[PDB]
Ligand SMILES: NC(=O)C1=CN([C@@H]2O[C@H](COP(=O)(O)OP(=O)(O)OC[C@H]3O[C@@H](n4cnc5c(N)ncnc54)[C@H](O)[C@@H]3O)[C@@H](O)[C@H]2O)C=CC1
Ligand SMILES: Cc1cc2nc3c(=O)[nH]c(=O)nc-3n(C[C@H](O)[C@H](O)[C@H](O)COP(=O)(O)O)c2cc1C
């Protein structure tokens with residue numbers, strides 16, 4: 134296959150994404166969910182791991198780690214400690230609103246995903262760390278989990294397979310850093326959301342010191358669809374090592390901001406012009422696109438013409454895929470105010486554990502608040518660049534990286550706009 | 564720990580008294596500020612035997628290696644779980 | 649805003665707080681989720697329960713959660729001062745949270761914030777003197793395609809104009825309960841100019857299932 138995009142409705146994984154059907158058990162079983170689950174559970178952990186590895190499924194959380202290779206770290210014998218699949222359902226990333234749609238509208242797909250994943254890694258229970266802001270979505274998911282227990286699908290003797298598996302829902306308390314897997318583990322343990330250090334990875338020391346896999350809502354929910362439909366079916370979409378479908382959240386300055394499931398290597402211009410109707414004022418009105426939520430560096434209009442929305446073609450554009458959250462920023466946008474507000478987000482949402490994020494993200498917000506006004510001299514651009522390089526790679530988790538990256542993207546793609554900002558400040562105040 | 568590298572030779576501290584004029588620390592011991600540096604112990608012992616000084620020797624107190632494990636802070640059944648981080 | 653405590657008369661360890669017996673059954677339900685020997689992991693739901701009983705957390709709910717879970721009280725003080733939901737000061741009954749991060753500031757949530765400020769006569773962080781509405785300004789709430797949006801205590805109010813949030817404040821002042829959804833012509837998150845996807849019927853059970861399963 135050479136072209137990508139224009140995904141058919143019959144090849145979608147997340148049917149009833151839009152809430153138009155019944156999200157409940159009679160609705161989910163009428164859409165293919167909870168079908169032949171016992172036959173998936175009885176064929177072993179190794180068959181499910183082979184289906185996920187063969188499918189080319191990568192991390193839908195945002196890093197794109199190989200999901201089958203991730204889950205195969207848990208296929209190891211016991212030592213007295215139980216094992217836990219823990220579903221990262223926080224989704225505090227700006228631009229990103231897809232896992233809210235998965236929990237609110239397709240909950241039984243997530244519950245069957247917890248069951249098939251916990252069978253695949255020998256896990257004992259499921260902790261869905263849902264965001265505290267997602268209260269109605271949490272009660273929605275708890276009604277669906279009640280419908281899954283009362284039908285005998287999970288709990289004692291899950292789906293009649295001889296396998297016992299619980300599913301819990303732990304609400305958050307309003308912390309973006311609790312979306313990171315180790316800080317999510319630290320938030321489930323009744324502590325501050327301060328990320329652990331790696332190694333120990335969660336597959337060795339995770340929640341409560343047990344073996345644990347923290348996995349995204351999307352990469353958990355699509356796994357029974359991978360086991361039912363096949364590995365080669367999910368591998369046929371997108372490029373090679375970029376296999377599958379993906380949820381895209383087109384927000385910002387578009388005509389129709391929307392969540393849509395789309396094939397993996399779709400062009401960005403085709404996606405924005407088809408599902409969102411294009412940029413407000415046409416495609417010529419486009420100024421910049423933050424391609425995958427706030428952690429990724431932005432790309433200008435000169436790159437959005439031919440770029441593809443998978444992992445590797447955005448890494449070639451010296452940005453990342455991340456959460457696949459397309460934030461569109463047209464010509465009417467002060468981009469420096471937006472990126473300084475984004476650094477304000479990364480200093481209001483940062484747990485203060487280690488030095489470079491705790492100090493330098495506040496210091497980058499102060500330098501960016503002066504760059505909005507232009508109250509600097511241009512040698513503080515490159516200075517700020519060095520500050521980003523003193524944060525990127527020297528922290529514990531990737532929120533220091535996720536805060537160094539937008540500063541680097543803004544400098545790299547709109548250095549002259551910052552320079553003319555500062556020079557017109559310097560002439561109008563002197 | 565760079566101040567715990569080389570052996571040193573000091574002496575007993577003799578009397579420091581108050582100067583009546585200024586309250587300064589007057590002293591009569593000439594060897595009160597004499598701190599000698601020796602790379603090994605037996606060089607200091609041979610030096611003290613050479614000058615007739617009666618010497619006492621403390622041995623080098625080294626810290627024993629500890630079992631450091633970051634995963635031990637998050638154990639399952641052990642008391643060494645940290646209460647916060 | 650401050651992260652130390654000063655013992656005011658209305659906030660001290662002698663401030664009255666105790667759970668209702670149905671809340672004790674709820675705390676039993678919370679503690680029974682977590683494994684034996686890790687009872688401390690029930691800090692964050694139970695303390696949030698101690699916020700849903702009182703509306704806010706004086707320092708007796710922190711002491712009560714530390715008392716019934718047998719954890720040190722400083723370990724609950726860290727949780728109450730770390731997370732942005734544990735209101736440690738008495739908020740109004742409708743705690744309005746306006747999201748003004750970059751995807752909502754692009755879609756002009758500043759106009760909604762100005763509309764709420766001139767409608768209620770207050771600003772960000774202040775409380776109306778009748779103690780109904782607390783207006784603060786929060787980070788990304790996760791409804792970015794439904795931007796610009798606010799949150800009222802459990803509820804999302806999305807795709808808002810200034811007229812829409814004036815309507816919501818009007819139907820909150822009279823005691824009525826609004827509808828927590830997008831206030832534009834769309835339903836949850838779909839493209840506003842009609843469904844560009846998932847118009848076909850979902851096939852149901854047995855579709856595309858590989859053999860040997
Ligand atoms: N989905 C969301 O809401 C958000 C997503 N992100 C994205 O998340 C990413 C950052 O996440 P991180 O966990 O810091 O990065 P990544 O390096 O650590 O981790 C992804 C997974 O890889 C596994 N892994 C990697 N190397 C391993 C090894 N040698 N042994 C065992 N396991 C290994 C980890 O266990 C982890 O579960 C970025 O791409 C960022 O864009 C960031 C913010 C929000
Ligand atoms: C600061 C930070 C916040 C994160 N927030 C989330 C999140 O909210 N949801 C999510 O699925 N992953 C989040 N991640 C990515 C996780 O570290 C991890 O990659 C993911 O939760 C599980 O990996 P997976 O892609 O195999 O599912 C975050 C990472 C960082 C550094």
Ligand code: SF4
Nearest residue numbers: 485486487490528532
């Ligand atoms: S760099 Fe920031 S987000 Fe990461 S452990 Fe440190 S304080 Fe936390």
Ligand code: FES
Nearest residue numbers: 747788789790791
């Ligand atoms: S930015 Fe306002 S909801 Fe995500």
